[PDB]
Amino acid sequence: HMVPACPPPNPHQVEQLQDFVSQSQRLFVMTGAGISTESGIPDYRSEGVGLYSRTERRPIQHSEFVQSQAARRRYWARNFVGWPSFSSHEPNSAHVNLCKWERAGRLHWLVTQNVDALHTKAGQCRLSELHGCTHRVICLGCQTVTKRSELQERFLNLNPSWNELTDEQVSDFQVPACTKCGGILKPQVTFFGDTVNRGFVFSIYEQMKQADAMLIVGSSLQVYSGYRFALNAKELHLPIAILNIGPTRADHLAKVKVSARCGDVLPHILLQ
Ligand SMILES: CC(=S)O[C@@H]1[C@H](O)[C@@H](COP(=O)(O)OP(=O)(O)OC[C@H]2O[C@@H](n3cnc4c(N)ncnc43)[C@H](O)[C@@H]2O)O[C@@H]1O
Ligand SMILES: [Zn+2]
């Protein structure tokens, strides 16, 4: 399964993370793909187990999606097949506990790199989805945003022989067009080489200014899109803590690092 193996969790690290969280009133939290491996969603870079470490998965480049009809067909045919299982994943105790922390007024804001909607399903309201969400679809022509669940029905009517990975296998596969303008639809996620909207970025940094600490959960921070927010914490003179099984790009900035499954540790952190 998808959770990398980890030595047994060290109690002293756990204690230091508690003390970190106790010192905070306005925690800024960043999560990545490690917070959803316990929900059955694989991560990308866990050594020996992530999609890029262990498999032939290559992300799609944005510019190829935008410039090639055939690339769009291959993308969408795979996304169509995977949607019923992908859409059925549930939040795990880590997402649930972060939502508790928000209810208690101790989590100031959370940013995720994940596109899986799990923080939303769990009920995290003070949330930014840094890379978007696969449950939303956007037209490249008019910017209208629709629900992915609604697109599925449309895929079924257009490709009824698929209800009975190369260009040849995808020939009988047609992609629904935008119903407002006839333009190209895309999952409202940040593909490789596309960049996050600068006003959105700027609004997340604005939430940081009032935090008093940062916690990173379940990200390698290898992608600059996420690591920049740890850099920003350091510029704000915020203490940083990490709860992550493998190494991260921010390990040198952290005051406290807990190498442990996040669903084993978070339920133990108390707010009183
Ligand atoms: C634009 C897009 S969607 O980019 C995606 C993604 O948003 C982005 C950033 O990736 P990430 O940091 O979210 O994911 P990854 O680099 O795979 O790191 C996940 C980390 O989680 C750790 N981990 C694994 N399961 C656990 C666990 N249950 N408890 C605690 N630690 C865990 C792993 O050790 C690993 O260091 O890169 C991709 O191309
Ligand atoms: Zn449109």
UniProtKB/TrEMBL annotation:
EC number in record: 2.3.1.-
Ligand binding (NAD(+)): 32-52, 113-116, 218-220, 244-246, 262
Active site feature: 131
GO molecular function annotations of the record: histone deacetylase activity; NAD+ binding; NAD+ poly-ADP-ribosyltransferase activity; NAD-dependent protein lysine deacetylase activity; zinc ion binding
Domain Deacetylase sirtuin-type: 7-272
Chief location bin: mitochondrion
Superkingdom, natural source: Eukaryota
First-tier enzyme category under EC: transferase
Compartments in which it is found: Mitochondrion matrix
Keywords, in A-Z order: Metal-binding, Mitochondrion, NAD, Transferase, Zinc
Cofactor: binding details: Binds 1 zinc ion per subunit.
UniProt-listed InterPro entries: DHS-like_NAD/FAD-binding_dom, NAD-dep_sirtuin_deacylases, Sirtuin, Sirtuin_cat_small_dom_sf, Sirtuin_class_II, Ssirtuin_cat_dom
Cofactor(s) named in the record: Zn(2+)
Binding site for Zn(2+): 139, 142, 178, 181
Catalytic activity: N(6)-acetyl-L-lysyl-[protein] + NAD(+) + H2O = 2''-O-acetyl-ADP-D-ribose + nicotinamide + L-lysyl-[protein]
Pfam families, per database record: SIR2
GO cellular component, one term: mitochondrial matrix
NCBIfam families the UniProt entry points to: PRK05333.1 (NF003738)
Role description: NAD-dependent protein deacylase. Catalyzes the NAD-dependent hydrolysis of acyl groups from lysine residues.
Family: Belongs to the sirtuin family. Class II subfamily.
Protein name: NAD-dependent protein deacylase
